[PDB]
Amino acid sequence: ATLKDQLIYNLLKQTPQNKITVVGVGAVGMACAISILMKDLADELALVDVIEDKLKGEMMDLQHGSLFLRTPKIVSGKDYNVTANSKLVIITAGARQQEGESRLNLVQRNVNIFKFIIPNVVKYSPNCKLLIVSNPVDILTYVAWKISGFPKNRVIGSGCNLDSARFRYLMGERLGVHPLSCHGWVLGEHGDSSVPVWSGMNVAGVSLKTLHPDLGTDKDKEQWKEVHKQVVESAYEVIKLKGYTSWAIGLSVADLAESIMKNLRRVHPVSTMIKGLYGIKDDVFLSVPCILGQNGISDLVKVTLTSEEEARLKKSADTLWGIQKELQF
Amino acid sequence: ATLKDQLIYNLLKTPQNKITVVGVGAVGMACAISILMKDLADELALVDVIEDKLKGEMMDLQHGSLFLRTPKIVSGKDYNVTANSKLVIITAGARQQEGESRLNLVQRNVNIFKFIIPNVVKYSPNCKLLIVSNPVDILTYVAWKISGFPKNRVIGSGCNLDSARFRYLMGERLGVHPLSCHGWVLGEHGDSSVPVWSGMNVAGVSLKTLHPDLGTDKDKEQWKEVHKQVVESAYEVIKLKGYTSWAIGLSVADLAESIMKNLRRVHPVSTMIKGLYGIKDDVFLSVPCILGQNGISDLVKVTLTSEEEARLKKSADTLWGIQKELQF
Amino acid sequence: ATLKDQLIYNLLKQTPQNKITVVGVGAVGMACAISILMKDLADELALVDVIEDKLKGEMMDLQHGSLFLRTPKIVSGKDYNVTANSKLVIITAGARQQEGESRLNLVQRNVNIFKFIIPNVVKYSPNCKLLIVSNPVDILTYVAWKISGFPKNRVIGSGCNLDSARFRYLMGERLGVHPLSCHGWVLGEHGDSSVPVWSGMNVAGVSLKTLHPDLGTDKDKEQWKEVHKQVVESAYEVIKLKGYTSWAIGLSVADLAESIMKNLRRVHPVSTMIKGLYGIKDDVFLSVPCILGQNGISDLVKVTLTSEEEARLKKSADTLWGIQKELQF
Amino acid sequence: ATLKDQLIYNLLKQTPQNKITVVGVGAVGMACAISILMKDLADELALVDVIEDKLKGEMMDLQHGSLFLRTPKIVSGKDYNVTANSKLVIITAGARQQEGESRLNLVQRNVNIFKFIIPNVVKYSPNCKLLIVSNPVDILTYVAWKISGFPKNRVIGSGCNLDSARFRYLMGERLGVHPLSCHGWVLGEHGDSSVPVWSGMNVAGVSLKTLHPDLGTDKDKEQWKEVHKQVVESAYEVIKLKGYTSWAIGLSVADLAESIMKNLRRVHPVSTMIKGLYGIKDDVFLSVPCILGQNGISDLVKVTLTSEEEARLKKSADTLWGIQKELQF
Ligand SMILES: O=C(Nc1cccc(NS(=O)(=O)c2ccc3oc4cc([N+](=O)[O-])ccc4c3c2)c1)C1(O)CC1
Ligand SMILES: O=C(Nc1cccc(NS(=O)(=O)c2ccc3oc4cc([N+](=O)[O-])ccc4c3c2)c1)C1(O)CC1
């Protein structure tokens, strides 16, 4: 009789209930993976990418580390059969713009990649929520939505979750207040064209615009426009100094994963289908405050925007549809 | 009146749990992210010589830390940012080049530590030093000698990770979760490490009692293959991925947790071993140590066989053989 | 040679860095104690009360349970020397109003008890923050402030922290929103006279009063006044059904302890010195949004109140000073 | 249009995945409940007891407190339909021995109560794990097993989980070691007749009995028998000083709930069906080291016991069967 049989009497022998997949194990993917592991969101974690050596190596490195956590099942493969029955699938894979390549051609190359990834994801996890991180995130959330045929509640983009956190932080810096005691959103298109919603900014329900009506206008003696500028410059300076951004996006994605996996029903400014709002008729995605839970987006908060704020979202929607209508599925 | 003064009436205008990570390579930043997310530090300092990359990593962490219990994160090539650290983690060093001798490699690491350690000591004289840089047993000695710190405040990451791997694979053999297995890998980090079969148990039922031939050459179950797989485990990560980051990061974070939160948990870490197992020389090896707010408060005196004592004694001789030739 | 000396070689020997004291081990005190233990806020916990048997029994019951937590040092005694070097001291002890006793006489009996407790606390922990839970909490926070001679930043009352949470919850119930995604305060005097600040109530920075200006008035077709009424009736119905309230106050106190012990700089509507605000000239304490951290109250948020809201706080301040000025120290 | 419809656009209108029931809202029940809430083990918590006022009052007090936690769904009722689809059902209800009542009559009164409780539990949660806390726990685990007809893996008693923790602590005290770095079990019948397994006691795999073979015998110069005595006296001294034990059992039960609800596969000395082991032929339950996970007891660790240790378990088994065979189902 073996040592196993002398030491252990077994009574019985199952399926995971909180499985997350990360597609793409570049810097961003693995930052998402380590952040998710350490918030203990998943009882099974699956990693998928096309370079088989690097992929298995990352799986093993995580596994060994995970001996010092609440150790989950970690699997990996180029084959999407390892992603079966995921509650949440996080897409970080994509193509980066090359010198002399047009925006249209770049998005089309991303579309062609998603035409392989998304149907494979849907085949193996038909009930999953899709969280799109790949840039440009507003367009590629649309792309994932179109190819998956999923309802709008189960297709989310990382959107302005991180930029809103940055905005809240710098707002705090101006007021001598911790970022956690500040509220305010950056909405619309992820990046340069994003909209600082001044009306919504408050500390303890005391709205900033009420006390200082010139906040965010050209006539602003305190020049709060410089805050939103610094939010945008913030991301570029990380890339200039370090080469790329990993930790910041990783922890923003983990924040969204937490709200979904633990049904927290917290508000996040994430890329969602925006048709019907702000005089937008086209099938585009932009960031508005959404309530995230176990079925993805359960509700939108209907933010009242000024004339100028509506114009900026409308302009972004036009630009995005301008590209989306030229894409070939 | 400004918006600030209309909104906020201010009444009032040092960190108690400051950690420094020296070196922001893959291992350093894996230590940093793992420490941040276990919420161990109210201030985190990063130090390295490449100024751009360093500031970039600080900023990336800072922005991410908006989704955690946000601590103060600072960075610089200047060690003045490390002032009043409770714990300083050394990951910096030099890697062996093809045809470079062990002695020359350690000497290049010694020359680097002759800059790092005195700067650390200047700014955090009461800190615990945790050495991760390889080879870890020798470089823990190096840090000890240059710092002049007492043996309790100079620790090497040692066999903390390898012991976890060992416990896991032991579990795999027995059909048991790694957390319900006990057992250590002691001595020199790497190929020469010692699987202590006597100590291996599940729920206080010792494996060697039920199967006395466990770990010998005449072992019909061949438990020697378990320790072999622990060592091959680390190499296969390097072959497949290029380097190891996440595994060492989380092992270091485990040790940081025990120290920063005064958990008084047992870890097989590199500590001064002179006096034990008939070792006369000033060498460091991994034995079970109780880690808390003052570093190593106690050793557990593990009874070793003749063969186990011989392997530690041999490692100690090899290590002293190199240590005595180093120039400080 | 002993088993101890054969097994363990000792290298060194200490003092606690995160010590909390709970004064009073009635239902409220022990609810505070268990809630604080299990949020892992304290490396030393001290319990103080006058009934020696019950006190030691509660200490031992906690100690044995704490073997399944990050086990802290737990001490107890009638002698305040066990409270030495507390960062935070929580006062739950006091006297309860008897049939035919006047409010003034009750407060005076509480003053006489605090004239024993507070100087003993101050003797042994001169740098501690005082958190007052004992009712009536606004007056007894003043009493603790006067006897301690502590600066206003280190003397806090549990105030409207719980009632505000209840308010946010019921606001959420009306809107079909999770309590965590609702904002709004109940300010002023703890209990019946507390003020629902309608102006501050919002979801994702969209203020409720903007969309529905009649919110909280007598001509409110949705009758949001019933929400604040239910917050007040809520507490009485617990007392009628169960006999007393323990768990709710315990977890509210633990919330405040967390912000203080972990320097979170989170906003809580707690009883603080209100002289200078809302045309109040007297030394009274009422609940306004305060930022809590390792030095207690670091900042107040200056909430803009309507004429009627100012009147209600002013009236409470007058009533409280009316009693405070008749007290004998 | 209502304020709700102006503020929130809803996309979706579910079932709990981690539901726990606590039967009995006495001191022990509510200590289990608060401890389970604060380790965040349940997304739905159900409380059941026969006194309707007290029950609803405790539910409301918990609910209000839970606004400062990851707020779960909390329900209550005398009707077991509130317990539907529980993963784990914790039984604390039962009868206490009255003056001049025989042990047999007491157990029979507990059996008669379980003949109402257990079939109602099984009806509404047929796949649940049963955790029995009610004393005497080894007999009432058997009673629950017989009435439920559940397999032995899904019927567990709190057993020697707490007493083993106490033992480990006092072992640590002798060696100058933190309780977390000590290992050792107290096995068999809960209470006076429990067996300190000296062979299993170790620090870092260095077995105490190897260094000191006289450990636990009458000619032990260090008198380690006094340690097990103090474990037993420990529980009585809490009852003498305070009146009852709540916090200690609450946190022991929460420890077991954690291992089950989070599939930790940790070893606990819990009451399980012991027929086949240690020359025991009868259907009795005693504490042996069991691996607890999402399906309850997945494995036993087969502890080698001395002749004297086998005799003590055999004697307990005889005593327990002596009573069990006289019970009327
Ligand atoms: O309390 C403050 N800040 C605060 C509070 C808690 C922790 C920290 N730590 S930190 O300095 O390391 C820090 C922590 C997180 C941070 O996110 C930032 C984002 C930007 N930006 O331009 O996008 C700039 C700076 C940060 C940033 C800085 C800083 C104040 O801003 C002084 C009120
Ligand atoms: O239950 C088991 N394992 C288990 C328990 C809980 C989680 C996991 N997750 S995992 O498969 O992803 C995993 C998780 C962690 C792991 O660490 C490992 C180390 C080595 N090694 O050679 O050092 C090899 C494999 C692992 C390893 C694997 C694995 C058993 O081994 C079957 C008893």
Ligand SMILES: O=C(Nc1cccc(NS(=O)(=O)c2ccc3oc4cc([N+](=O)[O-])ccc4c3c2)c1)C1(O)CC1
């Ligand atoms: O999502 C909601 N509620 C919700 C969210 C998460 C958990 C729960 N759980 S619970 O129903 O058990 C619960 C949880 C906490 C609760 O606090 C309450 C306070 C009062 N009150 O009179 O002040 C009344 C009821 C509660 C209350 C109820 C309830 C909505 O209110 C429907 C939006």
Ligand SMILES: O=C(Nc1cccc(NS(=O)(=O)c2ccc3oc4cc([N+](=O)[O-])ccc4c3c2)c1)C1(O)CC1
């Ligand atoms: O470090 C130790 N103990 C320790 C470590 C960390 C925290 C504490 N806290 S405590 O003193 O408040 C405490 C904490 C937990 C405790 O469990 C106990 C059980 C018994 N018993 O008779 O069953 C008696 C006492 C305790 C007991 C005491 C105690 C040592 O016992 C000296 C090794």
